[PDB]
Ligand binder design. Structure first.
Ligand SMILES: O=C(O)CCn1c2c(c3ccccc31)C[C@H](NS(=O)(=O)c1ccc(F)cc1)CC2
Ligand SMILES: CC(C)CCC[C@@H](C)[C@H]1CC[C@H]2[C@@H]3CC=C4C[C@@H](O)CC[C@]4(C)[C@H]3CC[C@]12C
Ligand SMILES: CCCCCCCC/C=C\CCCCCCCC(=O)OC[C@H](O)CO
Ligand SMILES: CCCCCCCC/C=C\CCCCCCCC(=O)OC[C@H](O)CO
Ligand SMILES: [Zn+2]
Length: 460
């Protein structure tokens, strides 16, 4: 069987000896442990794949189980000699040796060339905690100033983004801080592989969600500015919240792919976080590219839609009084007229006769609305730009790096799962750069407001 299964069998039976009241029930738990230890001895741990069956690393691996079986047999002798508390004492020693001989070989853990000294130097739980507190305080501030500001689709997406950033920092931040406080010894926080896999799912979820929500904001702006105006309705707010839920569900489904067998979550340098494995295996390539293509496309789509929206706002919030066809969105521009249909440039919409129709869809003047300049639309366009700039600067270096690592001609990662120290050190840098998106998205909303500008112009 798999190492993880034998590991579970071992722990399940350790709690059994712990609760146990007689020698016979301690004996059965100890017998199951011996079979699980002998079973685990035959296993090939992924971090020893390139190593030959008779290599030093494999000899030390198989030897660990001789030590475990020897400790099981020492507790079995104690149980067969009727001594209950003596066999429970010798069995509790296996909780320490299971960490030495099983824990480090679990699928979470790839091989690393990090020393105990390098770990003591990087470990900074107070720096990390302070930095999370700043991020959470920023997101609580945005939510607070959003509460005092009604049924808009843009603010719905923005509220989704702030709640995602806040929660992201809280969940992943507390795992990061715990790992720094434990000097990156995962067994101290959670023995086994469960916390690591939870960390990975939640890293993808809170990595993809702000990016997808940023693209949702660019889409709302584009449809809102290009198509005729519609007063923020309860239905539009409802539709925007349903969309935030679909985005969250899509980001969650994506994070669950390694649990379904597409990709894999492993502990990453310095040992404070888990993420997709930057390997050359089919699943590592597919999941790594799926994550980077999804994030890349979100930022790219945001760029395309925002440039069209800014250009539309500029052209529309200047010049003569414009009118839009509330059927196709055609904008009657007095500067141009409609000369092929008798309207020379300069003709104000009011001077166009009753029997003129839209040159795009052919409906009458009755279907035309005045294009009204709203400061709120400018405020929202500025905020959508701020969010797009923040995701470009913070998320793109990481997204490009993931895709580049996963696609490297000679593989970036060894068969055992080892990356070079420079690859690990860069991944940490880009991951740290990406964290700032969760800290800065609330500030774009806090700072890019008319009230902030009105209280800055005289104070500058
Ligand atoms: O140990 C490290 O330095 C990397 C961990 N890193 C990280 C955080 C942090 C907070 C303070 C100091 C270092 C930190 C907190 C940070 N959470 S997050 O911004 O919500 C986020 C970022 C990237 C991501 F893919 C998914 C979620 C995860 C990475
Ligand atoms: C658990 C995760 C994956 C998804 C949960 C989010 C979805 C299903 C839920 C939770 C909160 C909900 C929204 C809360 C706020 C509003 C505003 C109101 O005017 C109409 C309902 C509406 C629009 C709700 C629609 C659906 C909603 C977005
Ligand atoms: C948001 C919900 C997070 C999902 C948790 C998850 O994927 O569970 C991992 C598991 O603990 C690994 O053994
Ligand atoms: C790669 C990005 C792919 C999907 C993210 C796009 C999110 C989907 C955007 C939905 C469109 C939208 O935001 O709807 C606007 C409407 O005004 C609200 O009421
Ligand atoms: Zn028309």
């Amino acid at each position: 069987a798999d190492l993880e299964d034998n590991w579970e069998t071992l722990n399940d039976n350790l709690k059994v000896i712990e609760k146990a009241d007689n020698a016979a029930q301690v004996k059965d738990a100890l017998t199951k442990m011996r079979a699980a230890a002998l079973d685990a001895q035959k296993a090939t741990p992924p971090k020893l794949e390139d190593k030959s069956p008779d290599s030093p690393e494999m000899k030390d691996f198989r030897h660990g189980f001789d030590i475990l079986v020897g400790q099981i047999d020492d507790a079995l002798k104690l149980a067969n000699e009727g001594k209950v508390k003596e066999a429970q004492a010798a069995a509790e020693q296996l909780k320490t040796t299971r960490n030495a001989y099983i824990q480090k070989y679990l699928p979470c853990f790839r091989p690393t060339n990090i020393t105990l000294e390098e770990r003591r130097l990087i470990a900074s739980p107070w720096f990390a905690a302070s930095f999370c507190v700043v991020g959470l305080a920023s997101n609580l501030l945005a939510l607070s100033v959003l509460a005092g500001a009604t049924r808009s689709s843009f603010l719905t997406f923005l509220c989704g983004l702030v709640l995602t950033d806040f929660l992201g920092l809280l969940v992943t931040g507390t795992i990061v801080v715990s790992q720094h406080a434990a000097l990156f010894e995962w067994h101290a926080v959670d023995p086994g592989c469960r916390l690591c896999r939870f960390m990975g799912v939640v890293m993808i979820f809170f990595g993809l969600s702000p990016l997808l929500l940023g693209a949702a904001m660019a889409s709302e702006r584009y449809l809102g500015i290009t198509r005729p105006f519609s007063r923020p309705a309860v239905a539009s707010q409802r539709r925007a919240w349903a969309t935030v839920g679909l985005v969250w569900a899509a980001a969650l489904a994506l994070g669950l792919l390694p649990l379904l067998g597409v990709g894999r979550y492993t502990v990453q340098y310095p040992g404070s976080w888990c993420f997709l494995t930057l390997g050359a295996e089919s699943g590592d390539v597919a999941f790594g590219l799926l994550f980077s293509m999804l994030g890349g496309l979100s930022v790219g789509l945001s760029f395309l839609l925002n440039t069209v929206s800014v250009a539309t706002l500029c052209h529309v919030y200047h010049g003569m009084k414009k009118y839009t066809c509330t059927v196709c969105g055609y904008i009657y521009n007095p500067e141009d007229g409609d000369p092929d249909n008798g309207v020379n440039p300069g003709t104000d919409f009011k001077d166009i006769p009753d029997d003129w129709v839209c040159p795009l869809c052919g409906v009458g003047k009755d279907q035309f609305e005045e294009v009204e300049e709203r400061d709120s639309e400018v405020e929202m366009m500025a905020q959508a730009l701020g969010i797009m700039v923040v995701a470009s600067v913070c998320w793109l270096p990481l997204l490009v790096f993931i895709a580049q690592t996963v696609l490297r001609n000679p593989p970036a990662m060894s068969p055992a799962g080892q990356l070079s120290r420079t690859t690990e050190k860069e991944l940490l840098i880009y991951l740290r750069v990406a964290t700032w998106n969760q800290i800065l998205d609330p500030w774009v909303y806090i700072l890019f407001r008319r009230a902030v500008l009105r209280r800055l112009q005289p104070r500058l």
